Amino acid sequence: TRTAISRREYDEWLSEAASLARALRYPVTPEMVNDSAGIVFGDDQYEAFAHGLWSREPYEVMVILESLNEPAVDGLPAAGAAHAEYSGLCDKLMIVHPGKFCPPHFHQRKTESYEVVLGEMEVFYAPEPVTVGDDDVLSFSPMPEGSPWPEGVALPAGREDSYAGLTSYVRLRAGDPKFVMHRKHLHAFRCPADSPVPLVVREVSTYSHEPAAPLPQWRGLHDNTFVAEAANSGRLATAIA
Amino acid sequence: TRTAISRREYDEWLSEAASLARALRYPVTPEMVNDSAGIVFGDDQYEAFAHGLWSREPYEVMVILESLNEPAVDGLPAAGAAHAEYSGLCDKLMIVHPGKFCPPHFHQRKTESYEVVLGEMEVFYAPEPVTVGDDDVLSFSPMPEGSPWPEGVALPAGREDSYAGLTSYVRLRAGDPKFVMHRKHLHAFRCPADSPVPLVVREVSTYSHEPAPLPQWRGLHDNTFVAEAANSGRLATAIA
Amino acid sequence: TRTAISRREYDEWLSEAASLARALRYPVTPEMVNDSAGIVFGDDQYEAFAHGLWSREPYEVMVILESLNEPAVDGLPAAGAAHAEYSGLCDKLMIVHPGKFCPPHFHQRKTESYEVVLGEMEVFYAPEPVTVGDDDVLSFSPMPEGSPWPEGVALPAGREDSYAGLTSYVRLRAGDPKFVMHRKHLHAFRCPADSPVPLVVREVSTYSHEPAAPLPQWRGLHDNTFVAEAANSGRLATAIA
Amino acid sequence: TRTAISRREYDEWLSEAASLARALRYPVTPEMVNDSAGIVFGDDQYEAFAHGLWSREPYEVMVILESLNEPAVDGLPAAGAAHAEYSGLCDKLMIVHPGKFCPPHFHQRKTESYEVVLGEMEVFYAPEPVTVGDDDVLSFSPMPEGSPWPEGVALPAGREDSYAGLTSYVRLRAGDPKFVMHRKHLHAFRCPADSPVPLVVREVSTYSHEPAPLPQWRGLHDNTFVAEAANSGRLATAIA
Ligand SMILES: O=C(CO)[C@@H](O)[C@@H](O)[C@@H](O)CO
Ligand SMILES: O=C(CO)[C@@H](O)[C@@H](O)[C@@H](O)CO
Ligand SMILES: OC[C@@H]1O[C@@](O)(CO)[C@@H](O)[C@H]1O
Ligand SMILES: OC[C@@H]1O[C@@](O)(CO)[C@@H](O)[C@H]1O
Ligand SMILES: OC[C@@H]1O[C@](O)(CO)[C@@H](O)[C@H]1O
Numbered sequence: 005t006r007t008a009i010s011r012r013e014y015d016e017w018l019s020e021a022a023s024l025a026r027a028l029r030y031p032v033t034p035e036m037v038n039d040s041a042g043i044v045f046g047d048d049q050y051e052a053f054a055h056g057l058w059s060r061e062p063y064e065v066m067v068i069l070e071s072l073n074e075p076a077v078d079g080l081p082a083a084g085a086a087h088a089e090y091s092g093l094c095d096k097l098m099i100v101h102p103g104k105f106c107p108p109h110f111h112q113r114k115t116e117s118y119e120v121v122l123g124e125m126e127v128f129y130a131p132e133p134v135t136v137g138d139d140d141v142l143s144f145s146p147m148p149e150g151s152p153w154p155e156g157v158a159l160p161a162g163r164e165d166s167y168a169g170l171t172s173y174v175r176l177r178a179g180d181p182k183f184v185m186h187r188k189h190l191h192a193f194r195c196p197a198d199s200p201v202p203l204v205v206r207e208v209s210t211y212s213h214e215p216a217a218p219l220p221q222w223r224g225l226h227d228n229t230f231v232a233e234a235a236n237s238g239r240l241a242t243a244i245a
Numbered sequence: 246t247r248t249a250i251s252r253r254e255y256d257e258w259l260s261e262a263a264s265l266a267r268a269l270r271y272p273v274t275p276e277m278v279n280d281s282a283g284i285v286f287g288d289d290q291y292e293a294f295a296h297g298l299w300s301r302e303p304y305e306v307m308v309i310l311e312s313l314n315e316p317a318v319d320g321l322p323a324a325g326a327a328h329a330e331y332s333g334l335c336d337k338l339m340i341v342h343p344g345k346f347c348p349p350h351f352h353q354r355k356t357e358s359y360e361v362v363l364g365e366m367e368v369f370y371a372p373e374p375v376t377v378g379d380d381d382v383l384s385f386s387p388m389p390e391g392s393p394w395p396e397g398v399a400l401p402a403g404r405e406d407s408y409a410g411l412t413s414y415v416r417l418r419a420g421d422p423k424f425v426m427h428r429k430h431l432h433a434f435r436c437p438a439d440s441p442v443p444l445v446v447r448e449v450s451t452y453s454h455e456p457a458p459l460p461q462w463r464g465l466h467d468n469t470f471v472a473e474a475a476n477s478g479r480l481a482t483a484i485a
Numbered sequence: 486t487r488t489a490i491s492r493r494e495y496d497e498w499l500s501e502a503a504s505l506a507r508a509l510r511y512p513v514t515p516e517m518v519n520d521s522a523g524i525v526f527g528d529d530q531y532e533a534f535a536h537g538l539w540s541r542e543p544y545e546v547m548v549i550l551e552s553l554n555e556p557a558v559d560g561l562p563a564a565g566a567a568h569a570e571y572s573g574l575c576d577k578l579m580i581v582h583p584g585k586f587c588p589p590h591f592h593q594r595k596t597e598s599y600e601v602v603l604g605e606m607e608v609f610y611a612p613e614p615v616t617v618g619d620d621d622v623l624s625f626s627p628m629p630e631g632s633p634w635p636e637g638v639a640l641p642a643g644r645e646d647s648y649a650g651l652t653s654y655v656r657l658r659a660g661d662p663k664f665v666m667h668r669k670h671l672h673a674f675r676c677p678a679d680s681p682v683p684l685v686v687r688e689v690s691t692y693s694h695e696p697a698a699p700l701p702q703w704r705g706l707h708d709n710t711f712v713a714e715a716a717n718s719g720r721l722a723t724a725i726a
Numbered sequence: 727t728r729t730a731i732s733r734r735e736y737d738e739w740l741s742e743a744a745s746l747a748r749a750l751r752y753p754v755t756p757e758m759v760n761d762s763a764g765i766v767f768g769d770d771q772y773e774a775f776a777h778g779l780w781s782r783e784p785y786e787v788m789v790i791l792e793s794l795n796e797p798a799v800d801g802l803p804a805a806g807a808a809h810a811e812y813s814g815l816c817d818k819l820m821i822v823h824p825g826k827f828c829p830p831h832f833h834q835r836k837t838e839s840y841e842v843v844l845g846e847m848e849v850f851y852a853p854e855p856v857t858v859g860d861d862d863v864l865s866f867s868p869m870p871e872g873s874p875w876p877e878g879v880a881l882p883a884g885r886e887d888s889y890a891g892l893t894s895y896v897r898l899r900a901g902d903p904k905f906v907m908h909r910k911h912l913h914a915f916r917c918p919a920d921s922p923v924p925l926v927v928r929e930v931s932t933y934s935h936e937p938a939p940l941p942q943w944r945g946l947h948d949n950t951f952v953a954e955a956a957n958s959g960r961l962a963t964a965i966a
């Protein structure tokens with residue numbers, strides 16, 4: 005039981021993640037390795053450091069290195085400023101240790117894609133979208149059926165049912181085609197508990213609203229809704245001692 | 246003068262590009278390596294294959310391995326269907342050989358970004374955006390001024406006048422932060438002629454409208470090249 | 486039927502091989518990309534370029550990029566100068582296109598190891614050593630039994646029986662442990678004809694004698710004996726037109 | 727003062743090093759990642775784990791992933807058994823964190839070479855070889871003169887006097903040609919303290935005699951460190 009992470013644990017966690025990134029050729033600059041790159045989804049998830057990121061235990065903890073989050077507003081017809089928040093460009097590298105997760109959530113605006121760079125990624129998602137904001141949406145290439153869950157997945161203690169609605173499953177390996185996760189779709193993912201290396205996946209998505217705004221309606225905008233209330237709150241800052 | 250590329254030249258060109266991409270961990274699939282991946286911008290540009298891709302001669306030809314081109318239309322409010330074309334997600338690996346260029350052009354809808362993976366990238370662009378229509382556009386962080394062209398840049402014969410307005414220059418190297426090329430801006434880039442390796446650059450941008458997720462998107466070409474030759478062409482590589 | 490390779494074919498062959506090398510982080514400097522890096526084992530093997538290195542046809546052609554060939558003579562007790570030629574250090578990167586081979590041969594002095602960097606390597610070898618020079622040799626870790634040949638290997642036209650004595654087989658993939666090929670052992674290897682990429686393997690071996698000598702007895706020393714007489718000769722220079 | 731490393735510290739240290747190695751395509755196997763891969767040169771060097779491997783503090787500790795250590799005795803003429811110990815093949819990936827060192831030492835038999843894969847390497851060595859015995863040795867291409875030490879190098883406390891004779895300095899960067907360290911020469915190296923990544927260097931050398939291919943090779947230690955502390959130690963990492 006701990007409510008924070010020591011400065012040594014935090015620096016090591018991010019230094020090694022950024023080294024792996026740099027090793028894998030991701031464009032890492034110093035500003036990217038900051039106090040908000042290492043995410044702990046909820047105070048009860050700081051417990052992940054009791055034994056460490058190589059304990060292979062299930063926790064919702066991860067590091068994100070963002071190299072791009074472009075509003076893509078310049079040159080856009082002023083008439084399109086109403087939906088500009090559904091567009092934009094974002095490129096980030098995510099690092100998840102064995103058995104760890106990126107918890108159940110959905111985005112109202114952000115549509116994302118995945119590219120596994122190192123290791124393997126198990127994605128749990130809801131094939132059917134939710135309805136947020138506008139009731140009249142477009143449709144073109146609905147999410148695929150995926151597969152039933154594989155046997156043997158260890159879910160985080162005290163948050164197992166938050167995964168209840170993510171019934172579809174797909175395992176992505178390095179070299180596999182990009183996997184698209186449309187906006188308003190519940191999803192989550194982990195690095196197999198038995199992986200010899202951390203999971204390194206590049207996320208290419210639309211603008212990432214995660215609190216000089218491009219547009220006035222963009223200020224204080226939150227685009228991440230977590231199923232587990234606990235993870236919803238903590239995602240906004242990391243307690244470093 | 247060459248008017249097409251032999252099947253052998255084409256397959257070696259793309260096989261080697263796809264291997265280089267896979268060597269650099271870019272997710273290449275069988276379908277990404279097709280007869281349209283290798284682009285020749287204009288019939289007069291097939292002459293690049295007279296001496297080959299390592300002749301270090303100036304021509305406008307390249308390889309594009311597109312791993313992603315997502316409309317991102319699903320879940321988007323119907324209210325925004327009118328401007329969805331300026332959105333979407335595209336991820337591609339571009340391979341340009343020494344001395345070769347991605348010809349001068351601009352996109353009305355697409356905004357892009359570059360990530361140099363291998364070698365060096367010389368970007369030529371206009372810091373000021375063109376004015377297609379006028380319809381009051383938005384601004385936030387306009388294009389940086391850049392620097393003047395260094396000396397020694399050899400342009401393709403018969404196309405040199407098309408780079409006139411692209412007065413701004415930036416040189417991107419492997420490991421450099423992302424460079425953004427806002428829509429409506431004229432631009433072009435090349436692999437320095439003295440480079441020991443081909444330029445391998447990753448493009449992350451909005452949807453690439455090139456030959457139906459949305460009715461109005463049908464038959465949409467979002468690439469307008471300065472040179473009419475490469476403009477009215479580049480729709481299909483001629484392979485013999 | 487051709488007895489040489491055009492300058493365009495040669496430059497492209499080596500430029501792309503060196504780019505792959507550099508891509509894979511091998512230390513390539515300009516002096517390494519020279520007129521002797523692209524090897525054609527015998528005049529009858531120039532035919533490989535009739536259709537090209539992506540034709541997937543069986544030919545004994547390859548590129549070698551040598552980054553190190555250190556005599557390791559400095560500091561060595563003068564009393565050991567007699568066997569110094571069996572030692573030394575060599576590091577080279579080899580690139581073999583789909584279906585192509587590095588022909589049957591053995592070394593009197595050179596002991597080598599293999600590290601597959603990209604693609605897969607099929608090694609054909611003789612578990613039993615030959616006797617050259619000294620009759621009283623040492624022994625510690627004899628070559629392993631390997632496996633019988635797999636079905637479906639296409640051998641070069643007019644040289645199939647030169648492979649007759651290389652009865653053992655082992656398939657090496659990227660990430661596999663180093664494979665040691667002891668001196669005086671017949672061996673050869675190819676890149677599977679169906680590989681989507683060329684085979685890139687790093688060779689770490691003892692000094693490579695392949696015609697200011699470190700020692701006088703080293704001058705004009707040849708340490709490569711090919712089964713096929715044809716490949717023995719050609720290996721010394723490449724006919725570039 | 728620390729006297730050992732916790733099992734957790736050890737496993738994280740090697741797990742991360744092995745992942746970095748695999749990320750860089752180095753052939754790592756389960757058996758390469760063992761309780762001896764992580765080396766601490768001297769009991770007073772366990773203090774490096776007081777603040778950790780990213781404290782950028784000067785200590786002599788590192789990770790060695792040995793993919794090869796071939797005696798190359800097979801097929802070698804019996805006549806040369808006497809000097810076989812100066813031969814053989816060794817391939818290992820060494821991972822040194824910012825500010826950390828591979829302590830001053832020399833090998834009587836081993837000659838090595840370095841290939842920087844990631845980060846930068848600062849090598850300190852004596853251009854002149856030590857004289858263990860005298861037995862007329864051979865020469866061909868002696869060690870280059872090198873340059874003087876740059877300013878700013880922080881040495882490990884209590885060991886600084888052991889780097890006195892290593893007056894020559896060379897800085898190797900990723901992609902640089904191979905650097906050779908002939909046997910009998912004192913040397914040491916570190917990862918610059920301001921480095922954003924750990925130093926990843928590939929060692930290609932003759933056989934590494936460290937804790938029976940040949941009778942006389944039994945119990946042979948070919949590493950002689952200047953500092954007695956790291957000398958009489960380093961035979962086994964103390965893990966709690
Ligand atoms: O925009 C790009 C490079 O700036 C390319 O994707 C595009 O120009 C290419 O498709 C050529 O038409
Ligand atoms: O020689 C090496 C680095 O110069 C290492 O292999 C060796 O020093 C190491 O085993 C430490 O004893
Ligand atoms: O690259 C240097 C400058 O660019 C030009 O190549 C533009 O054509 C030359 O005018 C030279 O002045
Ligand atoms: O690194 C710079 C030089 O090396 C030293 O650190 C050697 O201890 C200092 O003497 C300084 O003069
Ligand atoms: O808070 C976790 C968020 O979820 C992700 O979209 C993972 O799918 C990341 O990009 C973060 O923005």
Ligand SMILES: OC[C@@H]1O[C@](O)(CO)[C@@H](O)[C@H]1O
Nearest residue numbers: 577587597688693695709720
């Ligand atoms: O001539 C091919 C020789 O054979 C090899 O040993 C391949 O086993 C290369 O290193 C070359 O020296």
Ligand SMILES: [Mn+2]
Nearest residue numbers: 109110111116
């Ligand atoms: Mn998400």
Ligand SMILES: [Mn+2]
Nearest residue numbers: 350351352357
């Ligand atoms: Mn463009």
Ligand SMILES: [Mn+2]
Nearest residue numbers: 590591592597
């Ligand atoms: Mn050989």
Ligand SMILES: [Mn+2]
Nearest residue numbers: 831832833838
């Ligand atoms: Mn040493």
